[PDB]
Amino acid sequence: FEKKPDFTLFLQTLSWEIDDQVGIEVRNELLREVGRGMGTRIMPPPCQTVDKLQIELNALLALIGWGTVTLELLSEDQSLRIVHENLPQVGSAGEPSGTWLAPVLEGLYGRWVTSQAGAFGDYVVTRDVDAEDLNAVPRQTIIMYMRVRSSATHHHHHH
Amino acid sequence: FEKKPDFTLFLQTLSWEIDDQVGIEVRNELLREVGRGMGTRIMPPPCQTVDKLQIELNALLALIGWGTVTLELLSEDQSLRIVHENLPQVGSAGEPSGTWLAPVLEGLYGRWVTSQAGAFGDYVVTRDVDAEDLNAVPRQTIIMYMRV
Amino acid sequence: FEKKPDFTLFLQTLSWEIDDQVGIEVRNELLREVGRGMGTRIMPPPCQTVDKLQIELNALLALIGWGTVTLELLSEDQSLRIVHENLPQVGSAGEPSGTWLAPVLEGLYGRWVTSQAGAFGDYVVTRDVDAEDLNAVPRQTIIMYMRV
Amino acid sequence: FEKKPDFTLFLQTLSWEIDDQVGIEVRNELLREVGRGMGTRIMPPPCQTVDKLQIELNALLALIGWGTVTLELLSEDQSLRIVHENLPQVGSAGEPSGTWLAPVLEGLYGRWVTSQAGAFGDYVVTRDVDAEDLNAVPRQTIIMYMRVRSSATHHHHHH
Amino acid sequence: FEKKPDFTLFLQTLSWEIDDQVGIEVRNELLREVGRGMGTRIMPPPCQTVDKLQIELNALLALIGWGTVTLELLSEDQSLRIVHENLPQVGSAGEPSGTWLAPVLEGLYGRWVTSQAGAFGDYVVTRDVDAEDLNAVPRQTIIMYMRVRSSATHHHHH
Amino acid sequence: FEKKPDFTLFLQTLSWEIDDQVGIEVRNELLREVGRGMGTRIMPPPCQTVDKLQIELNALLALIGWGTVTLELLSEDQSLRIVHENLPQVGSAGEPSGTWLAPVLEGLYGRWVTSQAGAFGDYVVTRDVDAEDLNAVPRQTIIMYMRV
Amino acid sequence: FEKKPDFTLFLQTLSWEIDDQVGIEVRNELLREVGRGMGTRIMPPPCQTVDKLQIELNALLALIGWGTVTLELLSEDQSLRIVHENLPQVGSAGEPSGTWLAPVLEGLYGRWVTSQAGAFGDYVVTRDVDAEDLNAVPRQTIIMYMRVRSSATHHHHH
Amino acid sequence: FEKKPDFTLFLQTLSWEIDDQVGIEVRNELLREVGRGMGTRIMPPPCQTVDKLQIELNALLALIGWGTVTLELLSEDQSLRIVHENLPQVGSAGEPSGTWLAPVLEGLYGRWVTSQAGAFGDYVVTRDVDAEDLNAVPRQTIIMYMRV
Ligand SMILES: OC[C@H]1O[C@@H](O[C@H]2[C@H](O)[C@@H](O)[C@H](O[C@H]3[C@H](O)[C@@H](O)[C@H](O[C@H]4[C@H](O)[C@@H](O)[C@H](O[C@H]5[C@H](O)[C@@H](O)[C@H](O)O[C@@H]5CO)O[C@@H]4CO)O[C@@H]3CO)O[C@@H]2CO)[C@H](O)[C@@H](O)[C@@H]1O
Ligand SMILES: OC[C@H]1O[C@@H](O[C@H]2[C@H](O)[C@@H](O)[C@H](O[C@H]3[C@H](O)[C@@H](O)[C@H](O[C@H]4[C@H](O)[C@@H](O)[C@H](O[C@H]5[C@H](O)[C@@H](O)[C@H](O)O[C@@H]5CO)O[C@@H]4CO)O[C@@H]3CO)O[C@@H]2CO)[C@H](O)[C@@H](O)[C@@H]1O
Ligand SMILES: OC[C@H]1O[C@@H](O[C@H]2[C@H](O)[C@@H](O)[C@H](O[C@H]3[C@H](O)[C@@H](O)[C@H](O[C@H]4[C@H](O)[C@@H](O)[C@H](O[C@H]5[C@H](O)[C@@H](O)[C@H](O)O[C@@H]5CO)O[C@@H]4CO)O[C@@H]3CO)O[C@@H]2CO)[C@H](O)[C@@H](O)[C@@H]1O
């Protein structure tokens, strides 16, 4: 036969449909879940330094051509900063536009750096969405932060 | 020369996630809708014969490298058998296993043939064998009918 | 894995043959029409912002690997500058040499932006610099305006 | 940048437009001319046997991925039979549908086998379009005949 | 740049080097371990039927281009035969010549098939290596079986 | 994911030029010498068995994509039959046409095989260019013998 | 099958073989002839301006992936300089090392530029080969000039 | 126009397995021996000048796509500086991470260079793994020396 099939247009019209029907919020949660899932299908070994983890992670991202990543350990607060380039673009959906697949990275990365034996054991992944940084960086560049889960206040425990 | 992103592992986990959360029926209507959606994005010209229509449809399928299709007219009803080969496979989801994307076709062909706002245009698509059993048919061969 | 046919030597001789027989003006209207034609075959969704529109247009251009485009709104008229990079080149035909396919874009963008049957939709495209001189602009960069 | 651009959809909508405006006849003549032209841009050396010419011709067709060809010298009348597979399909135009580019082959081949020093010096190329043969063979398979130009009768000389 | 590096020449000579130093037994255990290792880096989701697992595994194999596979539930032993096409050839090493990487599949399939929660924990994968089963199928075809592990009393030594 | 230059048209003209200026006979020695020299640049390891040698030679062949080979060790007298499939074809030069590159294999195989420890060290290579076992085999299939 | 054969290893050793037997002069004439030959098999259409010819030639070069070229009309000599990027390298042969196929371009450009009906009949192509013109540009860059041929009276010998 | 298998993930697991079971020190000899052995299988012709040797080595390097090399013949004492760019990276193994394959080049270059007639026959290869000329050079750039 021939070189295998194209899923952009599909994802283009899928993302549109899902957006049409579901909150920005609902969609993102579905999309993180899918990230977690992706991270359980493919994973790095147990790396001993962030630097090694980075090489390992890029290796994985190259399996599927989903771009490149840099990991900077911000020792001064002990957070981990995830800077990911060329998130695949699937049409104009997402905030900002072109960036719909972003929360998959959140799922994918949280699954990946948590799998890391003991180190970033119970961290959480926030995406950075602050204005100033987003137009310092290109469209498809996504900035995330990995920091340690602070637990809920009881005031919040009301769901 | 140059190459870029793949989406299939994503769809493997998406299909799964979706199926786990919504069920077969809701997932399928969603998938018909997306099928219809694509059909508004890329489309054939106004074809004069079923044969010509086939070519124009295969051209479009080639564009995204989803499979190939044979349209063939049925003299019983002016009904229309649609045989699609090599539907992209995205893991083991769907019924039968590996045909998760099948409703996209019902939607897609739903749009395309109706685009010919003439004889067909008041028509519908149904996706299984309408003997209601697909006989000796490869996985990734999806058989549909267009009628009314 | 597998690969197939190329059409560029054909277009080199076609462009030439056509130009030799019809002239610049008739060839160009023909080429706008074909531009429009493509625009009915493949098209974006109803975009809400000029930015979103850009992405959806680049997606389509990527589909056939004609170049890339930046749309940018002009606060003087709600006018619209269109900058298209890497128009396919098919030999030395056209003005400037190598831009034979340029009118296809006037036609194509003519269709696409009008598809947004709202603010634009009663608009027109004109293809040269409308300073009427393209300044320090690479060959295969085609600059157009959308107005009225 | 990236792998270079796709001309099918263009040709698809071009062939449609030209057909819309111009006779089947006018178009074919334009298309043969383009064939002649193509044959003047690329050409075989002077081959000494049809068999060699065939290898040479296929070589050229492979430059542009325009399919494969077989040449059988029909000694018994001294005509040359050209059987060409996978004429590139450009939409549904042409007679039969899918076959619009066929008369380019007529131009291309006549130019190619005529360039041949002295041998098929002043032959002409007819396409075979007879019903029976066309559905013995696939869509994109085109059958042509190269035979020696018989001159016009004066009765025909009235244009 | 240009589509990057080829590793066959590396493996042809790496396989030769290793074979020179090391018994064919030790080499196999090494290879089985890496196979078990590969299966930790890339895994299937939890499948409900063998058939699903087969689609799922083939999908994984496709990622790295290591051929295709067919699983077959043999209802009488509750054993499972694994027939794998087009193992990548890396020179003339292994038994038979060309199948050096076969022990890898043993580790790979063993990990993969086990990850499945259902029935399989404490199943072992062993390669079928028998005259006229090797003669019947092309050489880059590797045939394995998956049976339930048994344990051993007298059989404990050392 | 990128790509580079093509030498067929060149080699089509080269063979043509060469055959025109020097004989058929001296063209063939040239190519045998070249074939021999290629063999020095790329070479298999010390092979225990003929089966193993084959895999090894194919490895090398695959690496420059010059087709595939079969080695048949002949029982009756101490021969070694070499069947090479898919010799690169470089225009209509050679005999039969399109087989110009063939002596390269005489040189090439002559080298690889005699580099083999002790068993084959002192062998020759004539290509069996007989019509009887030719009108039956593909144009780009070349049949050789290792003997003495 | 799979995308077919690579000829560099052939040319590396063919170039070496030829160089061994034959003066570097004879080898060049041979190569120039094949270049003239290549230009008979693939040609530009009749161009009106140098610029058009440049688009047209680059188009031909693209067909076989033999690099890109820039032409430049030098108004004073009515001469024409041809600057060609990325000549395919085929081992270390030629002068300088790596440019063996350069004589080919001489034949190629000579044929191509001549096919143009206009001014050029009886123009000759000669390669520029001068210290610090070779040092200035990358090595797979070949610089040639195209001037009108002159003829010779005393200069006829043999 | 077709394509086949990938060994990176394998080699990611292999290095990992190997480093875990055998030392850093014995892993490196293994790889040097392998590198040496690769050098026997593929090899350049007898090179007149160091410049020529470079082109030749790159030719070989390109053939398996293991990156590019520079040879600097050192005047002060009789050294030969080897700078290899784009060593295939095979996971985070090695020191620095992702440079596991590096000793292969010690073996590889050690071989190719000493195969060279008379000038270099008796040389050694230690890779200058100094932080000073490392925190400046790319991770996949490897710097070696030929001496004695
Ligand atoms: O000649 C027979 C056949 O031709 C058809 O026309 C072309 C067709 O245009 C080509 O698509 C097809 O073959 C491959 C294409 O060369 C390649 O461009 C395509 O991959 C596209 C993909 O289709 C597209 O959805 C994707 O979108 C991008 C988005 O726009 C961006 O937002 C995002 O960032 O990136 C994605 C993906 O990169 O772009 C990719 C390009 O990477 O894959 C095709 C199949 O493998 O070739 C045909 C001919 O050569 C014509 O319509 C028919 O009439 C005819 O039968
Ligand atoms: O060498 C350094 C680098 O290597 C990485 O490993 C490889 C990796 O294995 C490759 O994926 C990658 O480059 C391309 C692959 O060659 C190609 O296989 C892949 O496309 C795959 C896709 O990844 C996969 O999801 C897809 O699944 C199929 C399903 O299994 C089926 O159900 C369905 O029917 O079809 C789909 C699609 O066909 O298969 C396709 C193959 O068509 O695309 C990759 C990018 O374009 O190359 C790497 C080598 O560079 C290694 O992980 C890294 O550590 C290391 O840095
Ligand atoms: O080896 C046996 C076989 O070899 C034949 O020679 C080559 C031949 O040179 C190749 O064309 C062919 O396979 C593909 C080519 O690698 C590729 O270059 C070609 O695509 C070309 C296209 O042919 C050409 O028209 C196009 O023109 C450009 C213009 O010049 C520019 O103005 C414009 O901007 O861009 C266009 C397009 O980019 O360039 C493209 C390159 O992108 O496609 C070929 C088929 O897919 O390989 C052969 C080797 O097999 C030789 O002739 C035979 O004798 C012999 O049998």
Ligand SMILES: OC[C@H]1O[C@@H](O[C@H]2[C@H](O)[C@@H](O)[C@H](O[C@H]3[C@H](O)[C@@H](O)[C@H](O[C@H]4[C@H](O)[C@@H](O)[C@H](O[C@H]5[C@H](O)[C@@H](O)[C@H](O)O[C@@H]5CO)O[C@@H]4CO)O[C@@H]3CO)O[C@@H]2CO)[C@H](O)[C@@H](O)[C@@H]1O
């Ligand atoms: O796995 C089975 C098989 O594997 C073999 O190993 C590889 C092999 O290394 C590859 O060559 C082969 O497939 C293609 C290669 O990916 C590609 O590099 C090659 O093209 C090479 C060409 O071979 C080489 O001569 C050429 O030389 C350059 C010069 O060095 C430069 O001076 C000059 O400027 O440029 C030329 C050419 O650009 O480089 C090109 C790269 O462009 O083509 C191969 C065939 O299409 O893949 C195999 C893996 O599948 C292994 O040896 C065998 O043991 C085994 O059977």
